[model samples]
Target: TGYLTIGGQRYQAEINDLENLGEMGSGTCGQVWKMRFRKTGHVIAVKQMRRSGNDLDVVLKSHDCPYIVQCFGTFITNTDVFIAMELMGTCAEKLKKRMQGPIPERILGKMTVAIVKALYYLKEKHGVIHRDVKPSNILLDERGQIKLSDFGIAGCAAYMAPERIDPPDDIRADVWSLGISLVELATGQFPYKNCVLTKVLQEEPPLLPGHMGFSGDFQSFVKDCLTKDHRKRPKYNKLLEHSFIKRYETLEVDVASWFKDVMAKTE
Candidate 1:
C-alpha cells in the first residue's frame, strides 16, 4: 500500500545501492522489493505492509526461528508499517512458470520436498506456523536453502489448514497451505478450475500425491499433509520425521534432477 520512500524518513540506505531486481511480485498483504543490504553487503528484501487492517503492532515476532525471516527492523507511521527482511530469490511459481509443459511426476517430487523441508524447519525449530506457505511465500536463496515467508497476517488464499488445526483464528495456519501450494506448483494453476472463489475452499484436493500424479511411498506422506482434516494432518514433528523427507534425503538428488524430468515429460 505504501511506497519504498516516505517523506524524508529513509530507514534503509540499501535502497540507493540496491538495483531494482525486477519487481519480485506482490502478495496478499503488500509489495516486496529485493534490495542489496549494504550494511551486511548482501541482498535484503523489504515489505511495506498496510497497518489499517488487523494488528496495530508490527510483525508477529517470535524467537530464534531460522525458518522465519530475521526481521532487520520495523517502523510505524500513521498510515503504514515498513518491515525489512532478508532477500531470498524466486519461489516455486517462477519455476513452474518457466516450465509450462508436461512435467514428470518424479521430478515434481524434488521441488515439493524442498518446500516441505522448509516447513519442517519452522514446525520443528519454532512453534510459529507459516500461515501462508504457498509458492509466493517460499523464498529461495542463492545457496539453495528455501525459506518460507509471509505468515498469514494478510489473509492469503493459499493459507489453509486441514479443518480446524489453524490455532487461533487470527493466527496463521501451517501445513495445509503448504499442501495447497505444492499442488498448485505442480499443476501450474489453482486447483478446482471450474469453481468460484467460495467453492474453492470447500473443494478437496487429490487425497494422495499419486492420485495427483505423484508416486512412491512419499506420495502417501504428502497426502497426509494435505488431509482435509487439519487434526489428522501430521504435526511438524511427525511430518518432518515422515518417510517423505527421509526418502528424499536418501536419494541425494539435487532436486534439479527431478524438475528436469518434469520438463522432459512435457517436451
Candidate 2:
C-alpha cells in the first residue's frame, strides 16, 4: 500500500483501492481510465502504462507545477505502472470541435497565457521542453483551468516546426507548434491542408486573417511565433511579455461559463 497527496488530500495509492469506471482514452504509452478511489470516493484519471523507462520517470517527477496536470501519485505492479492524475473535462482539440466556429479571442487569450506559463515552468524549472504543443495536449477542467499534459514524448506531424522537420531544433520549435495550433483554434480549421513540409518551409507562415476581428496584438504574437527562422522566433520568456499574453493574463474572463455553454451546444 502507498499514499498519494494531491492538493493536501491524501489518497490510497493501490490497484485494489481504485474502482475503474471506464476507459477515458488511449495514448502511445497506454490506456487512461476514469477511476474512483474507494477510500475517499475521489474521481481521477489513471494512466496504466506497460512500459518502464526514462519517460515514465520524468512524468512521475512532474508534480510541482499547477499549470501542468497534477499527478496525484503512482502505483506500481509487476506488470504495469498506474499513474493517478487530476481529472480534466476535455482537451482543447475536442473543445474546438464542439464549437460551431472560431473560438472567441478572449477565451483563446486566456488559454494561451496558461499554456505559455506551463511551457515556461517546464523549461525553467525542470530543463524540459514540451515538444508537443498542439491543441490535443492542452487540457481544460470544469473549473476553467487550463493545463498542459503528455510530456516526455512528441507526436502529430502537421504541427511540427521547420527546424524539427529538418535538422536543428530547440524550445523554439514548440513556439512554432503553438502558432499553428492557435491558428487552428482561431479559425476552426488547420492553416495548411496538404503538403505540410513544403508549406512550412517554403510558403509564408499562416496568419490570423484581418476579417476575423482578432486583435492586432494577437496577430502579431502569432507572427512572432511562426517566424521561419528559429533564431528569430521568440521563446517563452519573450512570449510571456507579448502584449496579447500580458493583456489576457490579468483579464477576468469567464472561461468556465464559456466552456459550459459550448459543451451544452455540442451535446
Candidate 3:
C-alpha cells in the first residue's frame, strides 16, 4: 500500500481498501464503480481502466478547481488503474432524460456558468483542454454544485466543432462542443439528428430557438460559441465575461432542489 498525492495532500490508497458497490457507468476507456473506501467509510466513484500509458495523468493534473470534479487519489493494480474521485448524484444526460421537456433556462444558465468556469480553469491553470464536453460528462451533486468530469477522453462525434471535424483543435474547439451541449440541454434533444459531420461542416450552427423565450443574452452567448470560424469563436476568457454567464453567476438558483426533485421523479 502506497500513498498518492492529491490537491497537495497525501492519502493512503490501495486497491483492497475499496469495496465495490456497483457499476455507475462505462465508456471506451473502461468502467466506473460506485465504491466505498473502507478506511473512511466514504462513498467514492472509482474509474477502473486498463494500464494504458498515462491515460489518467491529465485528470491528476486537474485537482484544484472547484468547478472540476475533485480527484481523491489513484492506485494501480497489476493490470488496472483505479482513480478515486468525488461522487456526483447524476450527469446532465441522465438528468435531461428525467425531465419531460427542455430544462428551464434559469437552471441551464447556472449549469452553463459552472461548465464554462471549469473549462476556463483547465485552460488557464493546467494548460489542459477538455476534449470532451457533453451532457454525459457534466455532473451535478445533491448540493446544487455542477462540475465537469472525464478529462482525458475524446468526446462524441455529434458534439465535434467544425474545426475539430476538419482537423488548434484548441480551446475554441471545446467552446464549439459546449455550444452543442448547451443547445442539446436547452432542447432535450441533440441538434444534429443525422449526418452530424455534414451538418456541423456545411449547415449553420444550431442556436436556441428564439420562440423558446430564452433571453437574448443566452441566445447570443450560444451564437458566439457556435460561430463557424474558429478564429471568431470566443475563448474561455471572453466567455467567462459574457452577459449570460455574468447574470447567472451571481444568482442563487437552487439546482440542488431541482436535482432532488428530478431524482425522485426519475426513480
TM-score: model 2 vs. ground truth: 0.87
| Candidate 3 local distance difference test against the native | 0.79
lDDT of 3 by residue, 1-267 (tens): 255554476777777767889887532233888888776677878788878665445566667678888877778788987777888877788777778478888888999998998988887887778887888888888898988885574125578778864432275889998999889889888877555346667788888898988899999999999999898899989998999999999988999898777776633
lDDT of 1 by residue, 1-267 (tens): 122322223344533445555545643233777665444455656676667765312333432444455555554667766566666645555656667643344444554566565556555555445555677666554444555565544223644553653457512246667666656665666664443344444767544435555665556665776776555667766765677666665665554444344344321
Per-residue lDDT of 134-247 in model 2, one digit per residue for the tens? 887888867888888855551246887887556452778899999998999999888775553466676788888887788999999989998988989998999999999999
Cα error, candidate 1, residue 151 (Å): 3.0
Runs in model 2 deviating more than 4 A are: 1-3, 8-12, 26-30, 49-54, 76-80, 153-156, 165-169, 265-267
Candidate whose TM-score is highest: 3
The candidates, ranked best first by lDDT, are 2, 3, 1
TM-score of each: 0.67, 0.87, 0.89
Model 2 gets an lDDT of 0.80
Clashes of 3: 0
Quote the positional error of residue 207 for candidate 1 in Å.
Answer: 3.3
lDDT of each: 0.54, 0.80, 0.79
Worst lDDT window (10 residues) for model 1? 1-10
Q: How badly does each model clash, as a count of residue pairs? A: 5, 0, 0
